[model samples]
Target chain A: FTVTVPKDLYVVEYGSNMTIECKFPVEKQLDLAALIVYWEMEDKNIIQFVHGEEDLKVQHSSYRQRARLLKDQLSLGNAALQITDVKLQDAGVYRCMISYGGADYKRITVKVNAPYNKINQRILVVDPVTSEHELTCQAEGYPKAEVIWTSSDHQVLSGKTTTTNSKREEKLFNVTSTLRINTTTNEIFYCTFRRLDPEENHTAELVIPELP
Target chain B: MFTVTVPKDLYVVEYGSNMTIECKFPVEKQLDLAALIVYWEMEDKNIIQFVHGEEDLKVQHSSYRQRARLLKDQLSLGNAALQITDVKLQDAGVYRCMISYGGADYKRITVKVNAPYNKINQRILVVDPVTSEHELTCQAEGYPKAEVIWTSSDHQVLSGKTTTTNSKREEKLFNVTSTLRINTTTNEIFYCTFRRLDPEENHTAELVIP
Candidate 1:
């Protein structure tokens, strides 16, 4: 079926052309060559487009011709569109829609923004460890988010071992990793994730109430 | 940074090809991209990816380097959107739309694997017409919480149907008896439904509408 994203908002600059693409599942029966895709806009007075046999583009005051479909990558369910040369007037929400017959589907939304924040990461597990715990960190973009960890002291079990999920597969995401300890004394600990720079950065602390 | 986003109702698609789900937030002013963090991951499998400002695009292994694209324009205005290409069966998991700006916003959507399937218990809800008791008992011996709701053709809320429930030990190890008591007979229609929320919650019963 159709799906979109693990929408993690990343930072971008203002007055820059912004682009987010949409991909769809393969429609085998339909003619890929003749599939007419459309891009529409919602929220705020932005421009919209209905491209098929004939192109119907909306040049609203707030939103201009700051976008278009990247027809090249539109294959095998890639319904991505690209928008160029943004301006203060063009700052608003946008949707990339694909129309077939009387029905049309569009992408979620895209926001324009400038760059902000500076972050650095650290591992407190020392040269090595003997237990397992989870460490996670996150930055805010469009979504206000924070990274969390279950062990900052790197201590957990009585076992003398710890490991993190450093490897990433096509589906695996982020630096939120976990570790397990196999020893006792000097093992149980408190953990937390704090931003290197705190320009209104988010932080939290984690501690194991008692040892088993 | 995250404004509560109502999931724009999407259509169910099939596996294979690609799947793109998007999320948008409503904000008034311009936002800083570099300070923002975006995360995308599939719940069906161990795939997760994220983007910071512009420099290093952290994509997981197996995914083509250039596959993930951000609608740069849509995001600044608070539209946290993303595109995913080459959909796979393993991609049939929950996709999360996340934004970690000054704060964090999170939304999850499950991408279902497309196939024709379902299993129905041959049982039915037994309701008597003439007697029309307020609390008419049905085959409701279940494991977890069942969908017990009022269903009237006239779309009206019925309140007076006081309910009392009981279970009886059956000779059959797995079977149990349940009874519903009704004070008065009325002309209202009610139905009960049950769905297995998890694997452990599954059972069968033959509702012989007595």
Candidate 2:
């Protein structure tokens, strides 16, 4: 008679699997044939289990083969929905409804994150008069990260650094940063990609070796 | 010229373990121990500090007072690494290391804490004792994703159907449970292996049936 979700919100990484867990209290093993369950997002059906099996006729085409209910555990009051290869579009509020003697539903939110782990950097001589070198760094991830450039003297480079972001597939971002710095022998500069959601930083170092 | 260097910008450590974040600065021949100053901070909260040739606890945060330390001996060689013991979930964040020797500079490093699948439990349910058939269940809780495989004592891969459920915990960690059915006559031993690809960690559990 009681339905509940352990957590109202879930954060999962992009391209990873996620399960939206739901539980309904049961005294004895229930009959699958008489039970009804369905999961929907924004009023669109994602998955359903009825007539002792999954009914794909009512499912949305976008969720076909991507979402399913834990049918084997349904008899034990587990109505969790499993989503494989989660995408950015899959981030939303999902409602799980179950019907036995009475009907109950719960809404849960899912958030997706993709870390900018693969950061590449290079340096080129852009101006010889000022010994100005251009440092370029590029990374791809979801939810744009703040690009900050810093010098070896613990000074943050403001006007000298330029950042550009472009949207890729699934709302992911491809970010590029270019920083103009006056070169010095044995100097080091850092490019930091900071994400507020996770409160983490991905940094790349450009070391200026001694001139030959 | 003064420069600060960190081995890497990011470090991923398994939960409940120790991690050393390395930092280096310019070395001087005189090595002024009295002028050396080193401290680590997270979100502006000091975790550990060393100044005037000794450890300083007055400015360290209470949570890290006893759990964090700086390699004071290595400071003479320009190594200002911070070592944290018994890393906790709250320790996963961006940390800044400030070093001073007549001049001051800093480096920032991010720490990621991952809980590995180390605590694995195996259970056996007697489906049909007469036929020597049983159901084996393995469960663990960890971060990121992991794969489960079943094998026999003879190193043969078992193609048994495995039903796995991965549910997210409150901290975005994973609670994994997998079940497999097997039938064997006489004494047999089986192994269940859990593999985490990203961190390259593996755990195995053995099951014996008589």
Candidate 3:
């Protein structure tokens, strides 16, 4: 009969490699220097995976070549593993069974989300399917544009904006903003643009027809 | 087209001031806005008011808080006449109209106000080419003070005897106009300004003689 370690452990998204260690019950010390430590994968088929004397060994060709043990980093009775190049397909139950006097096994599972690609997108409409609408004067520009919503009996912004540009980027001087509303029909909406430098303005009327 | 506009910015009525709302719709746009709901919200709700395809003298108010009544018009062809009588302090915000279309439509507006004001434009229209006797009328009304002056764009206007005084009167009617009259073309622009009486009010109307 044998005992096993946990089948899985936690790891960051899209990370690589993980560690697994197994221990055998050796309460009484009967040292004669003629003992070998072996590991077996116990499931449907019993696979004798590794052996150790001065250093741990691998079963070869069944697992990755990089799956090995560092003999210099072991504790008083610690036997551990180093798995490499982890992937989503490598998240199944892996048993760590040891055999010295009595054998035991533990299984652990690995989990990930990774921020390589994510999605975000938004839209706003004024008067849709409305018969008639008044142009609201509350213009909230991100950085507060100079607007004067005066035409069509509303406010038009009146001001200027300045942003720094690198040698590779060109700066645009004049900026105009328009509030747009979409609808099928039966309403009238007004949009206007005004400039104070020469003091002139024009109002555009929108009369959408009903959706046929 | 006939347009009804208050002198300059607005008419600043008192907190509980009594006021009358005036409206003007064009004769040319052939806007048959009869049976249309005429209201005066603080903002410009012309689209709402424009939907009234019929005329009535009753004030079709809302459940919220507003008192309005359909007033008068030059002719019934355009139901562009509306009036809101005796406005309250809460009515001090943007006033507008709500027009419900006979077809299917709606509209709203932001109204402008301060006090009850009237800025009337008077002209010295000629009576006869052979007659030299004609009368000039200077009339204006607003919530605050309104300025009236006579400036001739082409011909020399016979002025100097004209005077304007605000007798704390809410409305003004006159014997001389602030605008000059001429049959011959004198390329000049004559302006009647309702200036910065308040720090926030500025409005002007001008006639460019060609």
Candidate 4:
């Protein structure tokens, strides 16, 4: 059985609606009889639908109410997952798997962005506790963003990332990253943020002052 | 109208390290720090807490007990991030940080804990002489997940019957065993590889038939 996701990458908007399209080849159209479609994320089954069934309880608590199958399109072998009010938790890789006499799976990466995407980064010359220089990077968006700190020399630094949601909106969130480094010489550091879906990234630089 | 947020959303954490997931409220309204309440949870499980003031700080659950902390002094500045130490495989998940001030606002973040190395160990054995069947077994370890693939030594990717063992953890890395069955073929140097999806990294093992 051939299964496909029309778009490998999907970028949606926070609190907006979107659909993830999964289709079988139109030429070799598949029979919908005894079809069980499963949508999964992060190894967790988010939703399941049996063709011709009235209703089946979707398991994942995080996605149950917000995700649904486009039932009308099933005749065309379209089993897209429709999501409402996209949230950060909804940002990730999703798989559409179908089983009848045989089974096949395809994946789609979804990134839900906020209206305003901005990052503020800073460096503390000296930490009062450890006396080490600390670098912090912060950003706000939807469906979560990947944040990292790297040195110009291609070394990944040890860091911390903290995530929380915005008070004004349920779908918006804030992510913060901090790294403490001990340097004997001046160097350059970069803080980066990204969403795996839609493939987006942001970077900022820090100049470490020379040691006296 | 009340607000609580984490400044960032996606995090790539390292194994056996520490991470701080920040939760912040607003000071614009001069909200009473003594009255605001804070809580932290991961995958619906309670983790740590803060109520009112410094003395009200608390940590819950054995997994997060000594390893979780709330920045007390920073609380007045609207920082309610939970600091976690000795990060492990079980620590990776979506975390919800909530703060209540008259009303409550909550946010979620996906923490991707990355582990190192894509060392592929392999063994090839002839399973049957009657039909000339062969079994190729390979194993690799990493974090945030890895994929195993079969290919020709010439590098043309091919598919094989595969089995992935349940994951086991050591420090922050995940142990995975993959097996592929292929019919006896004249071609030599079958390739087995483990690939990391995010970093564009891979390690390979060659099966050179003598």
Candidate 5:
């Protein structure tokens, strides 16, 4: 049993239908009759089907209505899973498995993007407990985005990021990551997020109009 | 400013295979390999790195210990590709290759893995041929998914509402149940076919209506 991913990387709009296809070499002796197929992400089963009539299940709720198998091509060893209404949470590693004498599979990377908002990072001088100027960088998207703060002056400040997850009408999650820095120095801090993975970054300057 | 790119932005491979994510920078300037710092990272983890003055290339992280390495000699030839041996599900993700020479140039590579593609437990829970009231149940397991349906002997598609449930197993494998309901008054041979879409094969069962 062998599995192949047509492409390792797949990028789609935030809300669009996506089909992550995996093909495998069909062996003459291979039991397509006894074939057991599984699709997973982050080691969690998105869906799986065993040989027979009753056991075709999409296990993960995150993929419930959104994921389906192109069951019309199993005999040819084409095990492609079509995921619909792609969301940011759909961005991750996906594995498609076909079991024979042993389990062979392919892993695909899915990245969902959107015309997200600019970095909403700002410097606030306040204190729930301690009075310190805080540089807060906040951004939201799927696949749990990251927020990083840097200094044009090359100041090294420890970063604290807090993530809060919300769900929209669809199954995809609305993930927000807030990076905050506490310091007294007044300087221009560049807060960047939504970057590197697909290299789409948004930068916001939190420095004052006049030099600090 | 410099940019890096692979021969193809996409690379497809079978399970347990070897793959190389090729990254080439502009060679217009007779480049100095010794002055370049190359980094390949996935999310936050630094997978591999080549320091300008380091004695040798380094696999910077433990998660990628033996699985990842740099094409060291290719560095001198304006290539800083990463070769990964024995691909696994854990290795699937986006790897951003960043070169720090005069500035930073980044290229992203994605890896995908596939596993081999199930079970038959079919039974009729409710059947009353007179009133045409019946519930047929079947169970299956596979990758991608198995599309199961009820049909008539004459190749007519039978009408039924399907309900499904599943269990997750080893290596992200799954076990599922599909149920079809038949509530019509017809005396004919009914067929149930469990078809997997990817490979397009059919498993059939017959129940004679008496």
Candidate 6:
């Protein structure tokens, strides 16, 4: 007996839904009453179907409302596990166990990523004598982002740039980057936040007024 | 007003190498040596400066006092290039040159320091003494992140229960480690490669199971 998973690794976005697709060969129509299925993460029972009905009493408390199995697909040897409102803690190796006359299980890894979006931009003055203006950009996402600040002329602003990241609810990351500008000319600056593994880029712009 | 120029907006340098970042301004036949002021800064820290027809160290950052300098002879020709010896990984960043002669003008240059994965270490551990299953691990440290790939001796790709992790070190470089598990009693050779993109480089390590 053998069980198969479509992909060994699944990449899903945060706050979205995903189905871990699994399949098994059946010589004849599957008998729901004779089959037992269990989906687990790190040995914790996420959801289980025994004797053709879901056994919700044994389901993990954290996955009670978010994990389910489609009863209709069970007849076709499909034991896919559906998860909604995915969180960072949900990213890990999962096991799907199925048994009819024999037992077989397959493991799949899930990775979660949140895109940096809706960047907030602000400018403030820390010192008036040096005419130093601080341009700040903030955003929320998963995994740390590479922050880059550049002038309107496309010059990378490095020397006075600082970036920090903090973890928020659901383990999502909130990133903030600040650029210190000492110029007195009216100039536009851009802050670009980049993330890898399905590369994405988000940019925020700020304009500094000319100083008298 | 005068205009300042740099060789380019970006400069990619290998780790532990000397770098000469050039900055040029209007060349004058008889430049006003006393009135001219040139400063080189990385981030907000000043590294080198020229004033009153001589180099000044009083305002230079302590970390760069002895390691960085401007070409004294080229100063008359408006070449305020700053040369840094033994550039460290932390030296990689944006550099700005502020020049003051007839008028003030500044130019910015970006420096990227990268190190290739050359040295890789491998180890084998018996996960199950009775089952004879072995776990192989390979580790390497370098710049820019990298991914690990496993292949069998016969050139078939292998991905059986493997995990890779990349962590940034204090020097801002990446330290990558990958582990693979195998269940076989027969003698075999497995290869693991740490691959990096952008410049496309790979470093491989071989392990023999006997």
Q: Write the per-residue lDDT of candidate 3 for residues A58-167, one digit (tens) a residue.
A: 35444536455533222223345555654444445555555555555566555532211111100122223342222222221111223333323344433232222213
What's the alpha carbon RMSD for model 1? 23.1
Q: List residue ranges in candidate 3 displaced over 4 A.
A: A1-13, A25-62, A72-75, A112-212, B1-210
DockQ of each: 0.01, 0.01, 0.01, 0.01, 0.01, 0.01
DockQ measured for candidate 3 = 0.01
Q: Candidate 4: where are CA atoms >4 Å away?
A: A1-212, B28-32, B55-59, B118-141, B144-194, B198-210
Candidate 1's DockQ is 0.01
List model 2 lDDT by residue over A1-212, tens digit each: 76777568888877767777667765466767778888999888998888788889989899989988865456546676888988888889999998887789999999988777667655544334566666677787778887888887768996343344545554678888878778764478888888895597877766652211
Give TM-scores for every candidate, taking all chains together and pairing residue i with residue i. 0.27, 0.43, 0.23, 0.34, 0.31, 0.40
Clashing pairs in 2: none
Q: What does candidate 1's lDDT look like per residue over B1-210, in tens digits?
A: 233342333424432334556665433335677677766665433234444576245445455355556667667555666666644344455677666776677777666543211111121222444674433332332222333333344545534222223323211111122234443324443433333342324333222222
> What is the lDDT, from 0 to 100, of the residue A79 in candidate 2?
75
Note the Cα lDDT for every prediction shown: 0.40, 0.74, 0.37, 0.68, 0.60, 0.74
Q: Model 6: per-residue lDDT, tens digit, A53-73?
A: 899989889987898986645
Model 6: which docking level applies?
incorrect
RMSD of 6: 30.1
Across residues B1-210, which tens digit of lDDT does each residue of candidate 6 receive?
A: 356766357888765557888786754336678899998998879898788878888888877868999986667656687899767788989999999987888999999876766446455566787898888776666777888889987777567343334433336667676778877565788888889876889878667675
DockQ score, prediction 2: 0.01
Worst 10 residues of 6 chain B by lDDT: B161-170
- Candidate 4 per-residue C-alpha lDDT over B58-83 given as tens digits, one digit per residue, 9 for 90 to 100: 44677876788877655655567678
lDDT of 3 at A49: 35
Report the TM-score for the A-chain of model 3.
0.38
Worst 10 residues of 4 chain B by lDDT: B161-170
